[PDB]
Amino acid sequence: DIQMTQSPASLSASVGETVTITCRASKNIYSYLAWYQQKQGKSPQLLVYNAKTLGEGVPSRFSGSGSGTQFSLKINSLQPEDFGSYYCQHHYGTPYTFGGGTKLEIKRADAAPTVSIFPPSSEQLTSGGASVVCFLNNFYPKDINVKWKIDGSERQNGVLNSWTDQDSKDSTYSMSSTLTLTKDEYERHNSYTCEATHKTSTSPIVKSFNRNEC
């Protein structure tokens, strides 16, 4: 059983720039090495086989090289759609084993998030719970902190956070924050504020509301 090992485990670079990722077989495989690109939510797509041979249709940014036990992948002209996880698989004798992947982020210009708060739907209130949602979409870097100030006091309990993966159409990041409490506690306070702390500002981005006022 061969052990493919990749490096670095992640990496980012502007579009236009070039980057090389490497792979390690734990045994001499020959030129029996394939390379795939995966965009999260999607299936692996072929780029290279026979260590250097270019997959049918694959763009020429992609160059494959190496033999024996150490191989590499180079993308010149980093395009925005080359983000994703990259993987190497030996194709020498069974079982074909995959490397652990390499995460490629695409540096781009910064962007402050577009914060927007939404209150509990009446439908949910009816039921007996209340979730306040906040979307802070399309921002750059991926680093972002959101505080929840339930009437002014911050609350650490009741928050579920989720982040998409780098968008392709723009190279930016997005994320959701969800504060869920009961309509008892919900109706028992008025100010609901969502606050994003991001590098693009020294002052957080606050978005709020009045339970009581509409």
Partner 1 sequence: EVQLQQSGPELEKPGASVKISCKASGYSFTGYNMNWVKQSNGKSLEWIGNIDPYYGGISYNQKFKGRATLTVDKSSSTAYMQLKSLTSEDSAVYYCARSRTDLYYFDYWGQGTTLTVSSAKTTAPSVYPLAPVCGDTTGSSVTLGCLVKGYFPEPVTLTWNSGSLSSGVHTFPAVLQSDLYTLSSSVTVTSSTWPSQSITCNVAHPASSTKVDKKIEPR
Partner 2 sequence: QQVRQSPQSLTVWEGETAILNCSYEDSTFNYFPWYQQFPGEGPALLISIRSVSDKKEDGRFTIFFNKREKKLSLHITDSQPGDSATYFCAARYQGGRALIFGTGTTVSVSPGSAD
Partner 3 sequence: VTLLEQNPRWRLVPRGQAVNLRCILKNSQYPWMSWYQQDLQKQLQWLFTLRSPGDKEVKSLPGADYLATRVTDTELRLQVANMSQGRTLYCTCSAAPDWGASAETLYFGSGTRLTVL
> Which residues lie near partner 3 (CB under 8 A)?
27-28, 30-31, 50, 93-94
Which of 53, 116 has the CB closer to partner 3?
53
46 binds, among partner 3, partner 2, partner 1, none (CB under 5 to 8 A by kind): partner 1
How far apart, in whole angstroms, are the C-alpha atoms of residue 90 and residue 99? 8
45 binds, among partner 1, partner 2, partner 3, none (CB under 5 to 8 A by kind): partner 1
Which of 25, 104 has the CB closer to partner 2?
25
Q: Which residues pair with 144 in a beta bridge?
A: none
Q: Is 87 in the site for partner 2 (CB under 8 A)?
A: no
8 A C-beta contact, residue 154 and residue 195: no
How far apart, in whole angstroms, are the C-alpha atoms of residue 86 and residue 15? 17
How far apart, in whole angstroms, are the C-alpha atoms of residue 20 and residue 106? 14
DSSP 45: E
Closest listed residue to residue 5, CA positions, set 30, 42, 33: 33
Which of 50, 121 has the CB closer to partner 2?
50
Least gap, CB of 10 to partner 1 (angstroms): 14
* Positive or negative torsion for Cα 13, 43, 102, 143: positive
Q: Which amino acid is at 24?
A: R
Q: Give the footprint of partner 2 on residues 44-63 (CB under 8 A).
A: 49-50, 53
Structure tokens at 141: 């870097």
Least gap, CB of 31 to partner 3 (angstroms): 5
77 binds, among partner 1, partner 3, partner 2, none (CB under 5 to 8 A by kind): none
Residues forming contacts to partner 2 in the complex (CB under 8 A) are 31-32, 49-50, 53
